[PDB]
Design a protein around this ligand. Structure first.
Ligand SMILES: [Mg+2]
Ligand SMILES: [Mg+2]
Ligand SMILES: [Mg+2]
Lengths: 118, 138, 195, 176, 326
């Protein structure tokens, strides 16, 4: 697959999928994953082994896990923090008891450090 | 003629090097005070030493104050999380500490549905135009 | 009646192109290779292995004032060169580990434009450069010294551009031999002391 | 050149009726390989390499030979917009030094009789050129300035604000 | 009088001063803050902790006469007179020089033909004082905002002091909204910048021989990694003329703006698309609410294209013929 016009461009985007959730990024972006990572700690680096689509302004390589040979896209883990706390109030319509359903889900923050053709 | 209008660069923490977000952690406790028992135990138990060994880029202060026990933590961005570990036990305190370390200092905030990426880079492809569309409308 | 005014000045008409493309030496910009070779020889570019194109050399030689900057400019390269040059000087000072030699008069002298100009004059590279006199008869008051300095810096910049840093550094070192730039600096310092 | 298959940004749903719906796009998946997707967008603020014209690339850059700052529009068809008369019919350098001097003298003497337009008419030459050549009596300029000031004063509140806004807009429109 | 507290305090002060003069290695090692800093930035191990301490120490020889007026705004009670041969003053200059060189070079590499003014602006953005201060803050280089007497009372070792940044900071400088305006020497931001520069200088010093490019790499990781959109730096006077001049200079047919598409004429908000053609090669697309505006935009676009051209690493270093002049 002739991958020269991706090689030559300066701006380039990628659509990698973590657990099938697609995120479309360039280098320098901050991806907020809506879950807590146990594999990676803070400061670790993830090489993305599933990238659906690499694209320039006018050309785009695509494929179900396209070869890791072709590109280098690697993200560093910055933060593991939770999204803000909420108490959604659950109740019926003539019943005095209420069930406070609390929610403070967790986030993993990445930074796309490298995004290049290989 | 070309005139320059001033601006400044925006820091992207992880793209070149990665500075570790947490910098100082202050284990605060009290000799007297049952609420501070777990904290005291933690301080005693070589766990702190182990933690230090693990993570040398972050410094651990150990203060003595009369109130409830705390874990005030200080981050790169400037902000400071503070967790009162009232009446917790050793393991829970450790967990709290871990949580503190993991977080970047940034404030908590409600995310909307699917707001994942956060860029300051102009779109690689342009913003759509009706006149430069491949398919005209009717 | 395509009149391409060649006189002193009218403030409106375009001139004959062949009137302002002659530098104070006289040479036509379009004319000049031999000159480039001579310049190279003067520099001593071979020895350090500094390959420069003739075009680059020409650009280095010329200045903003010549041809209203219509022909290759000079300025960016000069700017680069100065930045490099200062750093190099600082490093030299450090070498000759102690950091209490930097903010001194000698260093300043070494850095300065006047010194550079003097060096250029000594070398005998003045005839080659392209620029315009403010008033043909008035010598440095036409702003010659600054131009010379720029040219010197421009050369350095060009070398940097061609060759990645190390080569440039080597060249600088060669230039600043105590056996042979710094000998001029000392003289300048002495002069300053005297006045 | 490249012989890639080209495609629109496809949706499994009807584009006409539901183009903003992200889900459709996500659902769509295309056969692995390279593709040509012309950007559905103008290249005004852009600095992308696939946006730069071949004439502005250096004679060495491999991108010159490649074909992705496409010349889709053709200059034959597009009407000239807000162009000077010298562009449509080439510039002229007919006017000598004596003539210029005379013009200057005239300007110095009587600006209201011998205004720029009049001068242009006389010497088959642009008003801009005339202006470049010759400064009018400073008194005249002063008078003009005064007049302008008066006009400005005569404005209402709203108009001034509008003017300011316009100015701001103008300023903006050279940023890109 | 069983306790001469003034004497003890004096002794302590003297000790502190001595330490500052020396920056003993052992003491530096003992300091936790310094250690943390070292780990954080992944500095080379050849760089000692004494050096680090020195970097954080700004030149403070003699206490000013501005101190004697705390009634008039300022009071300097935090600092202790530094050794003249062991300050960050020299290092700082070197660091600055390095920043000037390397950043500029990088910018040039990125964008040949970048108008000189614009280039300068970019450089400033990359390494202005404020930016440097911010960077320092991020790193965690904190300032000594505690009086010597206070420190003594606390009974904190000299290690902590060493770890902190040290310059003539005005204790009581923004109290009751009164700010005593002084020179560059007494500003926090400036100090921070100096410290940053000093660190770089130190790095250079240690890795001048074993790995010359190490410093540069470090800078890239930290200073050059920062986003700056170069497109946002420009501002043109009348760009059309400039464009024409550029065309003349190069081997291009005179530029002409032409209508490509138009919609909503006779409306509050129309759209006109004008390209600036040079023969056939379209030189700049430009949209606008008015025709004039569109034309202007096209010209600007063309100019941007000309300037912000970013050639590849596989190309042979391109050198522009300076800036267009009209
Ligand atoms: Mg019921
Ligand atoms: Mg209810
Ligand atoms: Mg529908």
């Amino acid at each position: 697959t002739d991958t020269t016009p991706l090689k030559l461009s300066n701006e380039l985007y990628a659509i990698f999928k973590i657990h099938n959730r697609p995120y479309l990024v360039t280098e320098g972006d901050r991806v907020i994953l809506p879950f807590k990572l146990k594999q990676a700690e803070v400061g670790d680096i993830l090489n993305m082994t599933d990238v659906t689509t690499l694209g320039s302004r006018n050309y785009k390589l695509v494929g179900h896990p396209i070869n890791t040979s072709l590109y280098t896209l690697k993200a560093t883990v910055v933060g593991k923090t939770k999204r803000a706390f909420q108490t959604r109030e659950v109740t019926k319509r003539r019943n005095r008891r209420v069930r406070h359903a609390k929610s403070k889900g967790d986030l993993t923050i990445l930074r796309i450090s490298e995004l290049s053709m290989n | 003629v070309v005139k320059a209008i001033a601006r400044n660069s925006i820091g992207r923490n992880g793209v070149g090097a990665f500075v570790f977000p947490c910098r100082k952690i202050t284990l605060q406790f009290c000799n007297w005070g049952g609420s501070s028992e777990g904290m005291r135990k933690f301080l005693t138990s070589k766990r702190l030493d182990k933690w230090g060994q693990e993570f040398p880029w972050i410094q651990f202060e150990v203060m003595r104050k009369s109130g409830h026990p705390l874990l005030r933590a200080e981050y790169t961005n400037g902000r400071e999380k503070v967790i009162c570990v009232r009446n917790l036990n050793i393991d829970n305190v450790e967990n709290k500490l871990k949580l503190l370390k993991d977080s970047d200092g940034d404030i908590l905030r409600r995310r909307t549905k699917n707001d994942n990426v956060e860029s300051l880079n102009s779109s690689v492809r342009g913003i759509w135009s009706p006149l430069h569309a491949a398919k005209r409308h009717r | 009646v395509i009149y391409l005014h060649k006189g002193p000045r009218i403030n409106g008409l375009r001139r004959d192109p062949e009137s302002y493309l002659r530098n104070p030496s006289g040479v036509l910009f379009t004319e000049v290779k031999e000159c480039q070779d001579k310049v190279r020889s003067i520099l001593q570019l071979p020895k350090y292995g500094i390959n420069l194109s003739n075009e680059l050399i020409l650009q280095c030689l010329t200045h903003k004032s010549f041809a209203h900057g219509s022909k290759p400019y000079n300025e960016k390269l000069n700017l680069l060169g100065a930045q490099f040059l200062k750093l190099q000087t600082c490093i030299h000072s450090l070498k000759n580990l102690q950091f209490s030699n930097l903010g001194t008069k000698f260093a300043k002298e070494l850095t300065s434009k006047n010194t550079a100009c003097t060096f250029v004059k000594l070398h005998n590279l003045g005839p080659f450069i392209f620029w315009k006199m403010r008033d043909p008869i008035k010598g440095h008051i036409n702003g010659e010294t600054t131009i010379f300095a720029s040219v010197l810096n421009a050369f350095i910049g060009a070398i940097l551009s061609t060759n990645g840093s190390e080569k440039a550094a080597k060249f600088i070192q060669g230039s600043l031999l105590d056996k042979e730039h710094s000998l001029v600096n000392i003289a300048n310092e002495n002069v300053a002391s005297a006045k | 050149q490249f012989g890639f298959p080209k495609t629109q940004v496809t949706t499994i749903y009807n584009k006409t009726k539901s183009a903003s719906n992200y889900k459709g796009y996500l659902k769509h998946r295309d056969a692995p390989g390279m593709y040509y997707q012309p950007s559905e967008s103008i290249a005004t603020g852009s600095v992308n390499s696939e946006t730069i014209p071949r004439s502005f690339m250096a004679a060495s850059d491999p991108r010159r030979g490649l074909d992705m700052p496409v010349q889709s529009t053709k200059a034959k068809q597009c009407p000239n917009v807000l162009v000077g008369k010298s562009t449509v019919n080439g510039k002229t350098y007919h006017l000598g030094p004596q003539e210029i001097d005379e013009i200057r003298k005239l300007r110095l003497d009587n600006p209201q009789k011998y205004t720029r337009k009049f001068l242009a008419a006389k010497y088959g030459i642009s008003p801009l050129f005339v202006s470049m050549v010759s400064k009018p009596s400073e008194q005249h300029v002063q008078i003009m300035e005064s007049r302008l000031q008066e006009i400005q004063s005569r404005w209402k509140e709203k108009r001034r604000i509008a003017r300011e806004d316009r100015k701001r807009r103008k300023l903006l429109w050279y940023q890109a | 009088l069983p306790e001469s507290e003034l004497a003890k305090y004096k002794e302590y002060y003297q000790g502190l001063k001595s330490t500052v003069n020396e920056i003993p290695e052992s003491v530096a090692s003992k300091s936790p803050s310094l250690r943390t800093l070292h780990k954080r930035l992944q500095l080379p191990n050849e760089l000692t902790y004494s050096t680090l301490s020195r970097c954080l120490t700004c030149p403070s020889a003699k206490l000013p006469d501005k101190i004697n007026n705390p009634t008039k705004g300022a009071a300097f009670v935090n600092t202790v007179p530094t050794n003249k041969y062991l300050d960050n003053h020299g290092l700082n200059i070197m660091g600055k020089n390095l920043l000037s060189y390397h950043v500029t070079k990088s910018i040039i590499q990125k964008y040949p033909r970048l108008p000189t003014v614009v280039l300068n602006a970019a450089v400033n953005a990359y390494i202005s004082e404020a930016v440097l201060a911010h960077i320092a803050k991020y790193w965690g280089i904190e300032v000594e905002t505690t009086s010597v007497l206070s420190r003594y009372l606390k009974m904190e070792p000299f290690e902590f002091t060493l770890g902190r940044l040290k310059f003539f900071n005005n204790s009581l400088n923004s109290k009751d909204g009164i700010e005593l305006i002084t020179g560059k020497n007494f500003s926090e931001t400036s100090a921070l910048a100096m410290s940053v520069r000093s660190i770089i200088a130190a790095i250079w010093a240690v890795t001048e021989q074993k790995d010359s490019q190490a410093v540069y790499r470090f800078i890239d990781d930290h200073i050059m990694s920062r986003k700056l959109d170069i497109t946002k730096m420009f501002q043109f006077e009348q760009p059309t003329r400039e464009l024409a001049m550029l065309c003349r200079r190069e081997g291009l047919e005179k530029p002409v703006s032409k209508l490509v598409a138009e919609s909503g004429r006779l409306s509050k908000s129309p759209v006109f698309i004008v390209h600036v053609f040079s023969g056939e090669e379209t030189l700049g697309e430009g949209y606008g609410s008015s025709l004039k505006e569109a034309k202007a935009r096209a010209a600007t676009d063309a100019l941007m294209k000309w300037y912000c051209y970013e050639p590849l690493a596989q190309q042979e270093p391109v050198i522009d013929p300076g800036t267009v002049v009209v």
